[PDB]
Each structure stands twice: as C-alpha cells, then as structure tokens.
C-alpha cells in the first residue's frame, strides 16, 4: 500500500567518485588518474587497471582505508531529497547498499555517515546487501546500470542515476533516469502510485 | 527458480542466548539473572527489565560491548546444516540479520563471524536489515515470533527456530517450526520446491 523506494548509496547519496578522485590524488600525486570527465563503466578499479599497471591495486587502497566512507560529501540536493522522500504519505524510504570486500571501516561508517546526514531514526531504513534483486520495492534509484543478482525478477523498476561513469550511456527501453536531485523525482514516484 | 532460504543469525547460527548469560552472569556476578530454561519473549532486555529496575540496562551494555557479537558460539549444527544447504542444487542461502542500534562493533563482528565459520566467499550471502519483511525468498528461518515491517504481505514463509524464549508458544496454524539443525530441514525446503 505505500510506496517503497530504494535509494542506493555510493555514487546516490555520497559522492564516491569525487571523494575517491580526491584521495587518489592526495596519495599518490605522481600516478595518473582518471578526471570525472573520462570515467566510463561502474568499475573504477577496472579503468584504472587499464589506466597503467598496478594502479587496481591503488585505487582499491584508498576505499579499502579508514574514514574514506565517513567523509564522503553528500551528492547535491540528496541529503534533502532523501528527507522529503521519507516525509511523503504512503512513501517508504530504504536506504540500500553493498559494501565493499573488506569490511573492518566500511560497514560501520556507512551506519556513522547516515546518522550524521539522517539522524539516529533513519538507522531503521539501513539494508546492506550485495545483492539489490532480493530486496523488494516499488523503485530503485541507483548508478550502477547491471543490477543483478539471485532473483531473476526483481520487484522493483530500477531508475538509472545519472553519475559520471553511465552519463553517456543509451539504455534499452523503458529504462529511466534520475538525473540528478534536483531533477523532478516526485514525478517518478508519483508515476509508480495507484 | 532456485528455491531461496533467509538464514538468521542470532539466535539460529549464533548462540546470542548462551553467550549473552555467560557474559552478562561474569560481568555482574552480584544480579539476578534468568536462565536459559526461564527465558520468554524474544525481548531479554525487557524481561531482564521486569527481573528488577536497571537491569534492562545492564542487559543491553553486554552487547554493545567490543566482541560480543563476534566471541558468539555457533549453535550445534548450524554451520554444518547452512554449508549444506547453500550447496544443494537450486538453492540460494542469504544470511538475514539485524543489527543492534549501536553500531560501532555490532556489524563488523557479524562479517567477521561470517567469515570465521563459512568463509571469504559467503560474506556476499549477508543481508543485515532491521526490516526483514523487504527481503523476498521463499523461506525464513527465524527464531523471533512476531517479524513484521513495512511489506504486510511478504514472499517468504516464515518458520520458527526454536529458542529457549519461544519454545513454549502455541503458533496459529498454519505456522511451522524447525525445532534445531538436527530436525528435518531439508523436508522443510522440499515443501517449497515445485
Ligand atoms: O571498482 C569498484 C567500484 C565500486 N566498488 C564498491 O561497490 C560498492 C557500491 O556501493 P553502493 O553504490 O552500493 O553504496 C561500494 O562499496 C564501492 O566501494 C568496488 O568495490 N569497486
Ligand atoms: O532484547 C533484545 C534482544 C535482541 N536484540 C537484538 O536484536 C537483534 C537480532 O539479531 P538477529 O537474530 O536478527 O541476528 C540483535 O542485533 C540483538 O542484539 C535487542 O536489541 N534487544
Ligand atoms: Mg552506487
Ligand atoms: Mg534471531
């Protein structure tokens, strides 16, 4: 009866690309890096491994360190959107993410950065997953074009967000994007509504 | 296709009810306690709550604290039953658990005890959630009575784990136990299967 939407972190709510880019720079000033410009396909260790050799390795060092999570700056207009969402009648707000392999920092400061931004209450909304396709609603917003997983037909209408990596993207049709938060969400919940 | 099993963790896998007493009886050797024979309702903070005034909190200090989670004993046969399970034909095993509020220690311990016991290659079977009603499966294995949550029709069917706290209760028909890892769990999911 309400509506339930999935809201993905990284690259949704944080600004995994700009963080990482930042830190990447910061750590290693004399490697070549990959500009938000020229990202293209969701796996950034993947570009860089392509970029030069060995340069997977560093990219997955700065996620894999302590508080690279907890820092990431909020992504325009989200932080808003997100709290508007969850106020809305008969609307249901989750936010849904996967963590990374190592887990000694990132699970914790997942649940450390949605308390600073949403508020001790919004912890109840938290669902950690690697696998999105068993978790059911009505919407999932999330950057990552290939959503798959153990179930074959996800329950949700997975809305593509635009990020610097899928921006030049052609989708099949009917899949839709967000572009941004301040592009007209609401419409694309209400479209879902009875 | 595959048939797909929700596992839960505390109280299922974990002995949460056994390392809990331990633990809370060696840090507070001058309270009363309730053994494991006394236990009702999912809840032990609340009844340790009506066992005598600050004890709820006393209870609830015993798992916020550092490696509680990750110090928990598997219960007999847990292990060796999901192993199994996740390695039968058509068959998919996520591990459905959710978090305490405090979550300085409470999610990382729980990977690492997924870790521990079924190794690197299961962390992607984790779910944690607070609302297990939004994860779609066909079973849930589940030691709690009353899971409800934002999805008032879930996919799944829930069958009871007996726990020390619930091994008394009547269930509405047509609810169905599994009664420890040594009961027939494979008749349980071949029910489910066409
Ligand atoms: O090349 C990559 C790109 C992203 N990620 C990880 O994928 C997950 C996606 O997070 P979210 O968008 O689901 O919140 C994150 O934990 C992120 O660290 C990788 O492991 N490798
Ligand atoms: O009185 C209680 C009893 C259990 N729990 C918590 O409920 C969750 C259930 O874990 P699981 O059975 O879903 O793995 C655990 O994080 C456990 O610490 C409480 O907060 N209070
Ligand atoms: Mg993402
Ligand atoms: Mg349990």
Redesign the interface.
């Given at each position: 009866?309400?509506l339930?939407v999935l809201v993905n972190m990284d690259g949704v709510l944080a600004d995994f690309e700009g963080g990482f880019l930042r830190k990447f720079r910061a750590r290693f000033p004399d490697q070549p890096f990959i500009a938000l410009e020229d990202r293209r396909g969701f796996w950034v260790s993947e570009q860089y491994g392509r970029l030069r050799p060995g340069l997977s390795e560093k990219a997955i060092s700065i996620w894999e360190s302590k508080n690279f999570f907890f820092e990431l700056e909020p992504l325009p207009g989200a932080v808003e959107a997100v709290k508007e969402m969850a106020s809305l009648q008969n609307t249901?707000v989750?936010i849904c993410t996967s963590?990374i392999?190592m887990?000694?920092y990132c699970?914790?400061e997942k649940?450390?950065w949605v308390?600073k931004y949403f508020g001790?209450d919004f912890?109840?909304?938290?669902?950690?997953?690697?696998?999105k396709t068993?978790?059911?609603?009505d919407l999932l917003i999330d950057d990552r074009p290939d959503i798959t997983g153990?179930?074959?037909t996800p329950?949700w209408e997975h809305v593509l967000f635009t990020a610097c990596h899928n921006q030049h993207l052609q989708l099949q049709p009917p899949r839709r994007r967000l572009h941004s938060w301040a592009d007209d969400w609401k419409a694309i919940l209400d479209s879902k509504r009875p």
């Open positions: 009866r309400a339930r249901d989750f963590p392999k887990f000694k699970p914790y649940y450390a308390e001790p912890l109840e909304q938290i669902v950690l997953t690697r696998d068993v978790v059911s609603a153990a179930e074959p329950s």
